[PDB]
Design a protein around this ligand. Structure first.
Ligand SMILES: [Mn+2]
Ligand SMILES: [Mn+2]
Ligand SMILES: [Mn+2]
Ligand SMILES: [Mn+2]
Lengths: 202, 203, 202, 202
């Protein structure tokens, strides 16, 4: 079974970019539920898999992907954020900084691309910076709902995720998702992104 | 072609309280629906252009924006009409043929309510739960759609009778993460008179 | 966990002629269904490993292959059983309660046949058309699924009674592009006896 | 309205890679149907758009995308194929050849990648070599059913498509889609791809 991980900073530490009220609900309620529902779906899967019940194994895939994906994505999300005073918003250095310049022209090129993609997500979803381990390239992509980046390709590793579910910004920014996407860059932990990039693992 | 406009609500913004806050009604109408309306108009202008120029690729590329914003407009226009203040019939059970049909298909009104609540609660991400009429069989269905897909994308002979918006902007300011509490209270302001009338004429 | 095997057909490869050629039954069974079974078994081995190692990302990455090959196995196992040679009851109308429910829900057996045929003809790409039982409401439904998604992915309380495969490999060698002709003839060998039993037993 | 385009070679000219029988049905029946139904859907679309019928405009989106996409994808397909004796299968020269080496290591790299993606398509679809006009990069991607590559990104332009619908190989290769995908490369028209790349239009 899985447990809700602690945040590496206080709930209020990403303000003003993200309010403490959102961080608290987002962590303790939304992420907590994915964890608990993933644990439950896993218990059922284990039974079905052991019993040779193919139909129930397939039936369980919706719940497994959604809550397991939910757990994966938010565990990553919390780690690719950091307070402005602790490195949040500081541009990536080294190879990732370079690779980003090579693939997107500049950090602002990437920020614009990911901001555009995030604003255009229909309904609930995520925008990602990823590393394609196969082709050795950085990619930008979105996933729907709680689908994790690896569902877009087995060789992809997420470096940065930005949650564009309404629960990620609505208490603070209401309908204005572009303002949320404008500000979130202030607390993006590019150090985290760099380490994942350097190791090719989260 | 025709441009579309934001329809007026049939009641004041605060009229659905306490079930749905006036703050939610106002933003939902003036910001979310309006954006679907305006982005639908813009998509139509490009579509009209692409169709006239014989640009098949752009016609098809535009289907995403057309379905999302056209869908958004359809769905919210219905949503506003299938809500009503409690003092004007909101939350009063359906009478006549729809009431009969509901008892026939779902056992009872509460059976239907249980079903739609369960379905709405289980919607992953953004979407809608619907009570619909299949015009072919003259039968009732409950179904969900993702994002702003309207019920007609699940079958061309379907007519939506009642929609419940389960996008987070439909409830988050008031109920936060607790969608089931929203789904518990939304039934107080469901306009079953609208659903009955739609059922009766089948559109 | 359990391994799965290709089930035997309840009749000879050629027994469904003229509606479905033996060449199709053979390749469809020995090659297509067999691949789903084997790829389902391989995905389960990786799933079991991932689940045991606490690897959420791999469990979720594997859901595509699990649903596709697991669904493929489920769907084809049902499909073989809801066909029968005309001389063994294939094409004979449902009796008992199902016949009644069909009359109640669709007007007549032909109302139903027209509906499933229209739905099958209209399937974009690969998929299935179903007569299903909603166990909660004790009601009949007609629905389609894409690729190898089983009916149970449309609602956990659904039980498939009759499936018609409208993947091109179910008909192409015999009917080529004319899927409606396939859908005209397949009704000669629909095993409504299986459907009744399932209906009666849920 | 649209009309069925002539092929740039005889039905049998792509043998042995693709049989003349497939080419003939694929062109005259499958593509013809997409053209005719697109024409019908556009007429209905035109009425609904003129009448201000939002609900019907959206209902027609499924038919517009499938049949419109079908016309687009197959119109391209015919042009990015050519007889081996007339330039089919000759590696791309000039900028596209360079770009392929830059992005995929080698033409064989690209071929392996696209073949792998094609084999893994679940149900009906396409594998594409595309040009991202925004990022100025080559990409490989798949689409489902008749979705054209532009539904994956508004700035994408397809250079090469390979149809992996079963009707594209089944009469000849039956279930062995990997053998179809192995041979199709002998008749890929890389000169067409180059022209598109050089001008950024089909
Ligand atoms: Mn979230
Ligand atoms: Mn809404
Ligand atoms: Mn099959
Ligand atoms: Mn084709």
């Amino acid at each position: 079974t899985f447990t809700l991980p602690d945040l590496p900073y206080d709930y209020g530490a990403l303000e003003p970019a993200i309010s403490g009220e959102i961080m608290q609900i987002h962590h303790q309620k939304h992420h907590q539920a994915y964890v608990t529902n993933y644990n439950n779906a896993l218990e059922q899967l284990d039974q079905a898999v052991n019993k040779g019940d193919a139909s129930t194994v397939v039936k369980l895939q919706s719940a497994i992907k959604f809550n397991g994906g939910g757990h994966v994505n938010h565990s990553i999300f919390w780690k690719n954020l950091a307070p402005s005073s602790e490195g949040g918003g500081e541009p990536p250095k080294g190879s990732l900084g370079s690779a980003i310049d090579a693939h997107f022209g500049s950090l602002e090129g990437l920020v614009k691309k990911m901001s555009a993609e995030g604003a255009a997500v229909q309904g609930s979803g995520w925008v990602w910076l990823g590393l394609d381990k196969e082709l050795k390239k950085l990619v930008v992509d979105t996933t729907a709902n709680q689908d994790p980046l690896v569902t877009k390709g087995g060789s992809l590793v997420p470096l940065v995720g930005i949650d564009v579910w309404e629960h990620a910004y609505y208490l603070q920014y209401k309908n204005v998702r572009p303002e949320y996407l404008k500000n979130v860059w202030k607390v993006i932990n590019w150090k985290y992104a760099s380490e994942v990039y350097e190791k090719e693992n989260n």
